[PDB]
Amino acid sequence: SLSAAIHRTQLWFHGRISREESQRLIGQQGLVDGLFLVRESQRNPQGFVLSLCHLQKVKHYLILPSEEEGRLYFSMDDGQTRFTDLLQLVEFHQLNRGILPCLLRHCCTRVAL
Amino acid sequence: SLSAAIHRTQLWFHGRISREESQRLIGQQGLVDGLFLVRESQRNPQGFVLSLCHLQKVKHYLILPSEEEGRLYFSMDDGQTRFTDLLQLVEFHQLNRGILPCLLRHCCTRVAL
């Protein structure tokens, strides 16, 4: 019912928050293996960062935009693996590791459901 | 690149926040006609609320789950107009007023961008 109501809302996305902020929020949600969020990058404000808990360590993956044949894509591996938006990136990594040490299993949010 | 990235993130959903906090956030973002958000009700554990600014006043429209014959829908008018989830409702009202005093024009984002 809640699940159904909010099924297509993307609670993993945090917008313009810091690296430190992401580690705090993740740290306080238990350092759960596979816990994650996406946010805007500080060091590169045109990009995004996937912040991911694995083995109680928090890791950050820079997501950069590029363009090819008039279409924009995002990549955290210098263009080897490409996505049309962050949602496609997140959905792919919920089932496949790719470069990551684990799946994206648990959304880290600051929303109360 | 941001709107290409956050395409399908549905930043209008805020989860459970008070009536006053909704009004605070709407005000903070400028009290534009058609500025809106969807939250969870503080009073009804299973209800949602569309909070929408028209003519410098915030109004609140309850969105309720209904289950008819093992099928779930959401509605703001006791099932005259039915929706599978919150996104369906929002997208319909971005184009059609329905029971509302204006269109849903501007997302009151749950995150800074």
Residue numbers in the entry:
A (entry chain C), B (entry chain A): 420 to 532
What did the article's authors report about this structure?
As a step towards determining the means by which Grb7 SH2 recognizes its specific pY peptide substrates and the G7-18NATE peptide inhibitor we report the crystal structure of the human Grb7 SH2 domain to 2.1 Å resolution. The final Grb7 SH2 model consists of four protein chains each containing residues 420–532 of the human Grb7 protein, 181 water molecules and 7 sulphate anions, and has an R-factor of 20.1% (Rfree = 25.5 %). The monomer fold of the Grb7 SH2 domain is typical of the SH2 domain family, forming a βαβββββαβ configuration. The βF strand, observed in other SH2 domains, does not form in Grb7. We have shown that the Grb7 SH2 domain adopts the classic SH2 domain fold excepting, as also observed for Grb10 and Grb14 SH2 domains, an extension of the βD' and βE strands resulting in a longer DE loop. Although the BC loop within apo-SH2 domain structures usually exhibits poorly defined electron density, the Grb7 SH2 domain BC loop is well defined and closely resembles that of SH2 domains in their peptide bound conformation. The BC loop is held in this conformation by a complex network of hydrogen bond contacts formed with a sulphate anion that appears to mimic the phosphate moiety of the natural ligand. These contacts include a bidentate ionic interaction with the side-chain of the invariant Arg 458 (βB5). Analysis of the molecular surface of the Grb7 SH2 domain indicates that it lacks this classical +3 binding pocket. The Grb7 SH2 domain crystallised as a dimer, forming a dimerisation interface (between chains A and B and between chains C and D in the asymmetric unit) analogous to that observed for Grb10 and Grb14 domain structures.
Human growth factor receptor bound protein 7 (Grb7) is an adapter protein that mediates the coupling of tyrosine kinases with their downstream signaling pathways. Grb7 is frequently overexpressed in invasive and metastatic human cancers and is implicated in cancer progression via its interaction with the ErbB2 receptor and focal adhesion kinase (FAK) that play critical roles in cell proliferation and migration. Members of the Grb7 family share a conserved multi-domain structure comprising an N-terminal proline rich domain, a Ras-associating-like (RA) domain, a plekstrin homology (PH) domain, a C-terminal src-homology 2 (SH2) domain and a region between the PH and SH2 domains termed the BPS domain. The interaction with upstream tyrosine kinases is predominantly mediated by the SH2 domain, which recognizes specific phosphotyrosines.
